[PDB]
Design a protein around this ligand. Structure first.
Ligand SMILES: OC[C@H]1O[C@](CO)(OC[C@H]2O[C@@](CO)(OC[C@H]3O[C@](O)(CO)[C@@H](O)[C@@H]3O)[C@@H](O)[C@@H]2O)[C@@H](O)[C@@H]1O
Ligand SMILES: OC[C@H]1O[C@](CO)(OC[C@H]2O[C@@](CO)(OC[C@H]3O[C@](O)(CO)[C@@H](O)[C@@H]3O)[C@@H](O)[C@@H]2O)[C@@H](O)[C@@H]1O
Ligand SMILES: OC[C@H]1O[C@@](CO)(OC[C@H]2O[C@](O)(CO)[C@@H](O)[C@@H]2O)[C@@H](O)[C@@H]1O
Length: 487
């Protein structure tokens, strides 16, 4: 049938990774140049978390962002009264001069006095990536360098070609967000290089990531402002050009969409390259009560599932995200696609489905891990269509990605009874009115890609073992080459 089925997630997820117990918080992806794979450290979340001692650094190893090997607890929390009672994001770099991996991280003091440092940068090292030893005498306090006591976090490490090691830290100075820069020859002694970049207006850029790709420098960041809660970027041809983008609040956006790569269900994205591709790892939030339409009052829930995406550098230097090749390759097993119900102005005709305003088609029940592809041609570039999940023939409500060409964005919405707008994802509308759609799912987590322009991560509890649907809200669409593969 095509009746709504009360499906449920497994404890663990293997592709949009989640451990058996707990959730994936801020990722710390690192290409390990000795093992020649990615070590994705991440902040381990539980429900509930201890009050004082939470968010230890766990790890998974992956070659390709599709299959993961669990590494367990790597850098554990300090004691209740220590500066790193709770751990926040940082960054890793391998030093071949002593053959040690250095992971810098944020030590979060439990209930600091007004004079204590809530947030301090600390470090641990490892020869093998298995046993980590804290440097119990290393503390980098923002305070000391005229930066903030309480917001001083998310250290990002990279080495420029001159061999100098750089550390960028999200902080504040003089009532404004500053990415602070520190330098070192050896990773042990550090000097202030002043402010790398100011943060636009009263925004705050969490989880900064600076890298060179082809002939452009990029800053990728996660915006803490409650109205945004998305992963954004800036670009520049030189390092100095990059830094200038936010100088005096210049606001030199890299593209026509303020460098917004994804929406509010992909956060804390940070990147790593194997020399062939650069991937980004972020998390897709959980929802309270498993309710796809409870996306938080001000901010979503923190942590959920690991989501890997692939950076696409366009030839004007702009970035979009597409699927990792190895994720796509996992979907080997073709499923039959059959119409289960029709409504309104809707025509099936061989393997082509045409829909006008108000019309919908419901297809057969998905499996657990799904790849859904189809081409959508619209009549005009003011038209609007819907990609709907958890839509049984008896569902009063369901969850849809609205592609509104007139508004130049996709939305995620609750449709049906108790319909409501949730959030959006601006992308480049095709000139030829043609949308090549791919959707990859692992249980309740999916990313929708269109034309190498849109990358839209969503949390959709119960999309698995439930029917899906296409609809037209405005104008007319014709739909072709509908496939579903699974694994
Ligand atoms: O938000 C739910 C989450 O809240 C607690 C609440 O006390 O967590 C967020 C706190 O986690 C800390 C310490 O590990 O680190 C947060 C990192 O998250 C970012 O903000 C990105 O989202 C990054 O900039 C930080 O390094 C601390 O800073 C927060 O207060 C937990 O109980 C629960 O998991
Ligand atoms: O289910 C109905 C739904 O509509 C409401 C109220 O009208 O709101 C949002 C709708 O507005 C649209 C734009 O026409 O967009 C979002 C705008 O806001 C931004 O996200 C931030 O500034 C921007 O990118 C857009 O301009 C439309 O697509 C939505 O349908 C909800 O109250 C109600 O639940
Ligand atoms: O839903 C809010 C909506 O407003 C936008 C429009 O640019 O931005 C304005 C935003 O920028 C500041 O000036 C800087 O902090 C804020 O004070 C203000 O709210 C969109 O980007 C956003 O989606």
């Amino acid at each position: 049938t095509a009746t709504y089925f009360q499906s449920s997630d497994e404890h663990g997820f293997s592709m949009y990774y989640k451990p058996q117990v707990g959730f994936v918080g801020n990722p710390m992806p690192f290409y390990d140049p000795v093992a020649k794979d990615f070590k994705v450290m991440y902040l381990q979340d539980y429900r509930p978390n201890p009050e004082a001692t939470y968010h230890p650094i766990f790890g998974v190893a992956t070659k390709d962002g599709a299959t993961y090997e669990s590494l367990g607890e790597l850098i554990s929390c300090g004691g209740r009264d220590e500066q790193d009672a709770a751990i926040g994001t940082g960054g890793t770099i391998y030093n071949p001069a002593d053959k040690l991996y250095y992971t810098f991280y944020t030590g979060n003091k439990f209930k600091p006095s007004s004079d204590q440092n809530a947030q301090v940068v600390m470090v641990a090292t490892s020869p093998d990536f298995k046993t980590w030893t804290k440097n119990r005498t290393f503390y980098l306090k923002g305070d000391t360098y005229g930066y903030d006591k309480n917001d001083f976090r998310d250290p990002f490490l990279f080495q420029t070609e001159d061999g100098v090691y750089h550390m960028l830290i999200a902080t504040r100075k003089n009532g404004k967000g500053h990415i602070a820069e520190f330098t070192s020859a050896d990773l042990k002694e550090w000097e202030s290089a002043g402010t790398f970049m100011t943060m636009m207006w009263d925004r705050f850029y969490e989880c900064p990531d600076v890298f060179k790709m082809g002939d452009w420098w990029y800053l990728i960041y996660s915006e803490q402002a409650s109205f945004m809660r998305k992963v954004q970027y800036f670009k520049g041809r030189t390092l100095e050009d990059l830094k200038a983008t936010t100088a005096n609040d210049a606001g030199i956006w890299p593209d026509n969409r303020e460098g917004m790569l994804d929406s509010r269900a992909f956060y804390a994205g940070k990147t790593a390259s194997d020399g062939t591709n650069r991937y980004i790892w972020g998390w897709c939030p959980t929802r309270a009560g498993n309710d796809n339409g409870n996306v938080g009052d001000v901010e979503p829930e923190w942590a959920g599932n690991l989501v890997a995406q692939r950076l696409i550098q366009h030839e004007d230097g702009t970035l979009t995200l597409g699927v990792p090749d190895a994720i796509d390759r996992k979907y080997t097993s073709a499923q039959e696609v059959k119409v289960m119900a029709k409504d309104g102005n809707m025509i099936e005709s061989g393997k082509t489905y045409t829909l006008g305003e108000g019309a919908s088609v419901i297809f057969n029940r998905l499996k657990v891990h799904n790849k859904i592809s189809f081409t959508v041609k619209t009549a005009s570039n003011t038209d609007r269509f819907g990609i709907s999940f958890v839509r049984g023939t008896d569902s009063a409500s369901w969850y849809s990605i609205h592609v509104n060409a007139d508004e130049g964005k996709a939305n995620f919405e609750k449709d049906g009874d108790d319909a409501k707008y949730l959030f959006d994802n601006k992308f480049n509308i095709p000139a030829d009115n043609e949308y090549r759609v791919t959707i990859y799912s692992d249980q309740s987590v999916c990313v929708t890609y269109i034309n190498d322009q849109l990358s839209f991560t969503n949390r959709i509890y119960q999309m698995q073992k439930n029917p899906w649907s296409l609809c037209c809200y405005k104008g007319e669409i014709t739909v072709s080459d509908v496939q579903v593969s699974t694994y």
